[PDB]
Design a protein around this motif. Structure first.
Motif, PDB file in Angstrom:
ATOM      1  N   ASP A 108       1.748 -10.620  -3.933  1.00  0.00           N
ATOM      2  CA  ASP A 108       1.920  -9.168  -4.064  1.00  0.00           C
ATOM      3  C   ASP A 108       2.974  -8.857  -5.123  1.00  0.00           C
ATOM      4  O   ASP A 108       2.749  -8.005  -5.989  1.00  0.00           O
ATOM      5  CB  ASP A 108       2.320  -8.464  -2.761  1.00  0.00           C
ATOM      6  CG  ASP A 108       1.125  -8.159  -1.881  1.00  0.00           C
ATOM      7  OD1 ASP A 108      -0.017  -8.411  -2.336  1.00  0.00           O
ATOM      8  OD2 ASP A 108       1.328  -7.704  -0.731  1.00  0.00           O
ATOM      9  N   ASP A 128      -8.187  -2.273  -4.982  1.00  0.00           N
ATOM     10  CA  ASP A 128      -7.580  -3.472  -4.392  1.00  0.00           C
ATOM     11  C   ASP A 128      -8.589  -4.380  -3.688  1.00  0.00           C
ATOM     12  O   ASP A 128      -8.552  -5.605  -3.870  1.00  0.00           O
ATOM     13  CB  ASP A 128      -6.467  -3.093  -3.411  1.00  0.00           C
ATOM     14  CG  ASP A 128      -5.848  -4.298  -2.721  1.00  0.00           C
ATOM     15  OD1 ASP A 128      -5.278  -5.172  -3.414  1.00  0.00           O
ATOM     16  OD2 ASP A 128      -5.964  -4.389  -1.476  1.00  0.00           O
ATOM     17  N   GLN A 183      -1.209 -15.289   2.139  1.00  0.00           N
ATOM     18  CA  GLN A 183      -2.031 -14.492   1.229  1.00  0.00           C
ATOM     19  C   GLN A 183      -1.450 -13.110   0.945  1.00  0.00           C
ATOM     20  O   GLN A 183      -2.095 -12.324   0.243  1.00  0.00           O
ATOM     21  CB  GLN A 183      -3.452 -14.356   1.782  1.00  0.00           C
ATOM     22  CG  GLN A 183      -4.085 -15.677   2.203  1.00  0.00           C
ATOM     23  CD  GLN A 183      -5.544 -15.534   2.609  1.00  0.00           C
ATOM     24  OE1 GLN A 183      -6.062 -14.421   2.728  1.00  0.00           O
ATOM     25  NE2 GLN A 183      -6.214 -16.665   2.827  1.00  0.00           N
ATOM     26  N   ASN A 184      -0.257 -12.802   1.454  1.00  0.00           N
ATOM     27  CA  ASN A 184       0.383 -11.517   1.224  1.00  0.00           C
ATOM     28  C   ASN A 184       1.863 -11.650   1.558  1.00  0.00           C
ATOM     29  O   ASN A 184       2.252 -12.491   2.370  1.00  0.00           O
ATOM     30  CB  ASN A 184      -0.299 -10.420   2.052  1.00  0.00           C
ATOM     31  CG  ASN A 184       0.666  -9.626   2.890  1.00  0.00           C
ATOM     32  OD1 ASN A 184       1.111 -10.084   3.940  1.00  0.00           O
ATOM     33  ND2 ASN A 184       0.970  -8.409   2.455  1.00  0.00           N
ATOM     34  N   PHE A 196       0.806  -1.211   0.000  1.00  0.00           N
ATOM     35  CA  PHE A 196       0.000   0.000   0.000  1.00  0.00           C
ATOM     36  C   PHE A 196       0.843   1.266   0.000  1.00  0.00           C
ATOM     37  O   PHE A 196       0.301   2.356  -0.214  1.00  0.00           O
ATOM     38  CB  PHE A 196      -0.952  -0.013   1.192  1.00  0.00           C
ATOM     39  CG  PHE A 196      -2.012  -1.080   1.105  1.00  0.00           C
ATOM     40  CD1 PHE A 196      -2.881  -1.131   0.021  1.00  0.00           C
ATOM     41  CD2 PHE A 196      -2.135  -2.039   2.098  1.00  0.00           C
ATOM     42  CE1 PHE A 196      -3.854  -2.115  -0.061  1.00  0.00           C
ATOM     43  CE2 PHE A 196      -3.109  -3.025   2.020  1.00  0.00           C
ATOM     44  CZ  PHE A 196      -3.965  -3.063   0.941  1.00  0.00           C
ATOM     45  N   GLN A 243       1.138  -8.653  -8.095  1.00  0.00           N
ATOM     46  CA  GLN A 243       0.029  -7.748  -8.349  1.00  0.00           C
ATOM     47  C   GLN A 243       0.569  -6.478  -8.994  1.00  0.00           C
ATOM     48  O   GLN A 243       1.764  -6.348  -9.271  1.00  0.00           O
ATOM     49  CB  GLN A 243      -0.728  -7.440  -7.057  1.00  0.00           C
ATOM     50  CG  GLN A 243      -1.759  -8.497  -6.697  1.00  0.00           C
ATOM     51  CD  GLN A 243      -2.562  -8.137  -5.467  1.00  0.00           C
ATOM     52  OE1 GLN A 243      -2.082  -8.259  -4.336  1.00  0.00           O
ATOM     53  NE2 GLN A 243      -3.797  -7.684  -5.679  1.00  0.00           N
TER      54      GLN A 243
HETATM   55  O1  RIP Z   1      -3.943  -6.814  -2.149  1.00  0.00           O
HETATM   56  C1  RIP Z   1      -3.518  -6.347  -0.861  1.00  0.00           C
HETATM   57  C2  RIP Z   1      -2.137  -6.830  -0.568  1.00  0.00           C
HETATM   58  O2  RIP Z   1      -2.099  -8.278  -0.712  1.00  0.00           O
HETATM   59  C3  RIP Z   1      -1.668  -6.446   0.803  1.00  0.00           C
HETATM   60  O3  RIP Z   1      -0.522  -7.227   1.135  1.00  0.00           O
HETATM   61  C4  RIP Z   1      -2.713  -6.681   1.901  1.00  0.00           C
HETATM   62  O4  RIP Z   1      -4.068  -6.225   1.521  1.00  0.00           O
HETATM   63  C5  RIP Z   1      -4.487  -6.819   0.215  1.00  0.00           C
HETATM   64  O5  RIP Z   1      -5.753  -6.427  -0.083  1.00  0.00           O
END
Ligand code: RIP
Length: 283
Positions: free
Chosen positions: A220, A95, A194-195, A22, A240
């Motif tokens: 990411d 996002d 997930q990140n 972000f 991303q």
């Molecule tokens: O897409 C973003 C990224 O993955 C961030 O790492 C955390 O929030 C998510 O929504």
């Protein structure tokens, strides 16, 4: 309603700036803003659903022409969205999505597809029935319910789950979480985060416990994550486009006030990044 792109006031509500992802979004947003002569005020919410609500109304009273929102909770942002709907201030989502409210457009990835590629990478690299952890994110964010769904699609079959706890998109919480998850399951072979903040936090926990063949997959595409792949601390990430996200959101606000129609949905492309791909799809 046609205002000038020059001297256009835009509010930008980002969930948290402790996350490099972000931060890359802010930086790419301000670069696009200054390039097309848009005045812009960014407001960090620190993963708070109430500070965001107040950040929305501050833009509303600032008399901005559009509010680029990155929700922290997809359910709680709806009330504030109707508040900007009543004030006739277009809302552009970035996002993450929302559960209701009148939104001009939404720029985000296919987070279900992102979960898809991670399990596919695990099954393709480590075979089928391989023992794996998942590191889920903020439970109220659309990106974590979708990443978990897309992951478990190819994970009910083809993979054996030892655990699935959340670390709220945070390096430190993931470091602690992973360390405790390892204590119970020494036989872990893959960790899906997930990140990238959690992936990088799991990598420190894996190497602090002396485990040498635990394949780690993140999401990411962050610069440090490219470096962990080269250093071998993680194995792959699902890239991303945080900057290209906030820049086609800004252009949507410009195009709206230009009398041009803007798409209701815009899917950001995602890409796998392995040790052979580290040079590509970088932010
Ligand atoms: O897409 C973003 C990224 O993955 C961030 O790492 C955390 O929030 C998510 O929504």
């Amino acid at each position: 309603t046609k205002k000038s792109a020059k001297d256009l006031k835009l509010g930008v509500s980002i969930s948290t700036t402790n996350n490099p992802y972000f931060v890359a979004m802010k930086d790419g947003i301000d670069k696009y803003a200054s390039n097309k002569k848009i005045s812009i005020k960014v407001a960090d919410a620190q993963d708070d659903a109430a500070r965001q609500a107040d950040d929305v109304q501050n833009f509303i009273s600032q008399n901005v022409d559009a509010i680029l929102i990155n929700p922290v909770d997809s359910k709680a942002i709806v009330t504030a969205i109707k508040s900007a709907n009543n004030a006739n201030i277009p809302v552009i989502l970035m996002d993450r999505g929302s559960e209701g409210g009148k939104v001009l457009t939404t720029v985000a990835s296919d987070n279900v597809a992102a979960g898809k590629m991670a399990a596919d990478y695990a099954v393709k690299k480590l075979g089928k029935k391989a023992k794996a952890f998942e590191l889920s994110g903020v439970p109220g964010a659309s990106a974590t319910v979708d990443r978990g769904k897309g992951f478990h699609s190819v994970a009910k079959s083809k993979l054996d789950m030892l655990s699935s706890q959340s670390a709220n998109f945070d390096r430190a919480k993931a470091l602690n979480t992973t360390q405790n998850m390892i204590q119970g399951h020494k036989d872990v072979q893959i960790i899906f985060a997930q990140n990238d903040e959690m992936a990088l936090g799991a990598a420190q926990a894996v190497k602090s416990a002396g485990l040498q063949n635990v394949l780690i997959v993140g999401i990411d595409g962050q610069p440090d994550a490219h470096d962990a792949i080269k250093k071998g601390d993680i194995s792959a990430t699902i890239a991303q486009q945080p900057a290209k996200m906030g820049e086609i959101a800004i252009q949507a606000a410009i195009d709206y006030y230009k009398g041009k129609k803007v798409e209701k949905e815009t899917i950001s492309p995602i890409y796998l990044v392995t040790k052979d791909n580290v040079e590509k799809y970088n932010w």
